[PDB]
Amino acid sequence: GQKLSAYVVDWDLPKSIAWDKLDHIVYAFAEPTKDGELSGFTDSQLKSVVQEAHSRGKSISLSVGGWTGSLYFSDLLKSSSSFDNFVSNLVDVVKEYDLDGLNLDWEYPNSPNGVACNSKDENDTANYLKLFKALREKLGSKTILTTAVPTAPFNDENQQPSTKLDDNWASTVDAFYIMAYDVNGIRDKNAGANAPLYYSPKVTGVEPTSGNDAVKAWIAAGIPAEQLVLGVPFYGRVSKTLEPITASTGLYVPISQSSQIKGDSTDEKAADPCPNAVATYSGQYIWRTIAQEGIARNSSGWVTYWDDISKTPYAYSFSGSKVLSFDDAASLQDKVDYAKKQGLGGVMLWSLEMDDDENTLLNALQDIRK
């Protein structure tokens, strides 16, 4: 298995990759086109990084899909001819780039969530498994086949999270990388954690999930814990509170749902790949910024707190009335402790370039690889 996997992104590769602090690089993203070709990544970068990984004895997978790369998965897999062509192209990419694996990041099978104009079909989840089976048959047992997954099992024919997965999921796919981040946001009445480790039903106005709830849901639906990988963020998110946060309010306070405020300098306005889509901010605030601004020592207009329920830090800036939910060394350690206790297969991180030059967050993950 891969104890610690790190996503790196084509549009912003890390200036230096800390190879000795990770086991697996996941290169994001190749985006399937309407014709089932793989586009949206930089040839020379992937070849450079594969060579570096291999020189260092490290495994590298290509991640296929991602948020803006999921438009065509449903269409591609629901037609026999496009399915076969897509499979052929995926096998070709593995050979062309000497990849050790493929990480499929369809966001999401049969879902009106994810990019609004994504194709969708009742058979999406069954077809996704068919895809993994085809890849397994063509590439063999050595290739690492993984999938990045939401906080509940893949949707069934009625767009409901599956309560019982086909046991060929676990027997075909090596690992399931749970995206236990971006959990709360403007779709919720109250602020909540970006990557809560726990969720308590006593808290209303937030999404009723967390790392723990997600892991439990995936295990309950049939995936053994050792094939689950807990994903963690190297960024936080800002929300705009309607009233100030104080020592008395805690994190879970009412927020503006009118529009997502900008996070840090990495938070560029961007529109989803749909007709007439409006450009929006994500509220992303990467660790490098959190560290540089001294948020943790109440600098730069922030006052920091810890949320004991979710086991994550948060901070309030009276200027702009912003709450930042984030992860630090302590909260990442707590996620690792949880992952080890649950006997998970490992952890993964999104994404590597977000760490500071001292590898503060990546260092916080090291207990998973021992």
Concatenate the DSSP letters of all residues of 304-361 into one string: EEEETTTTEEEEEETTTTEEEE---HHHHHHHHHHHHHTT-SEEEEE-GGGS-TT-HH
The set of residues, in sequence order, having a beta carbon less than 8 Å from that of 240 and lying 6+ positions away, is 255, 256, 261, 320, 321, 322, 323
Rounded to a whole number, what is the largest CA-CA distance in the chain? 60
Strands 346-350, 228-233: pairing kind: parallel
Please confirm whether the linkage preceding 351 is cis (ω < 30° from 0). Answer: yes
Q: Which two tokens stand for residue 170?
A: 């676990």
Selection from 81, 80, 130 nearest residue 104 by Cα: 130
Question: In which residue are the tokens 């660790």 written?
Answer: 287
Question: In which residue are the tokens 């690889």 written?
Answer: 369
How far apart CA 9 and CA 79 sit, in angstroms, is 30
How far apart CA 220 and CA 165 sit, in angstroms, is 9
Q: Which two tokens stand for residue 322?
A: 């912003």
Alpha helix positions (H), 5-106: 43-55, 73-78, 80-97
Q: Where are the domains of the chain?
A: 1-233+327-370, 234-326
- This entry's atomic model was obtained through X-ray
How far apart CA 148 and CA 1 sit, in angstroms, is 15
Declared resolution, Å: 1.6
Q: Which two tokens stand for residue 332?
A: 């990442």
The set of residues, in sequence order, having a beta carbon less than 8 Å from that of 312 and lying 6+ positions away, is 193, 194, 195, 196, 197, 306, 325, 326, 327, 331
Count of alpha carbons within 13 angstroms of residue 46, beta-carbon side = 24
Residue 296 burial class via C-beta count within 10 angstroms: exposed 0-12, middle 13-18, buried 19 and up: middle
Q: Which two tokens stand for residue 69?
A: 């790369």
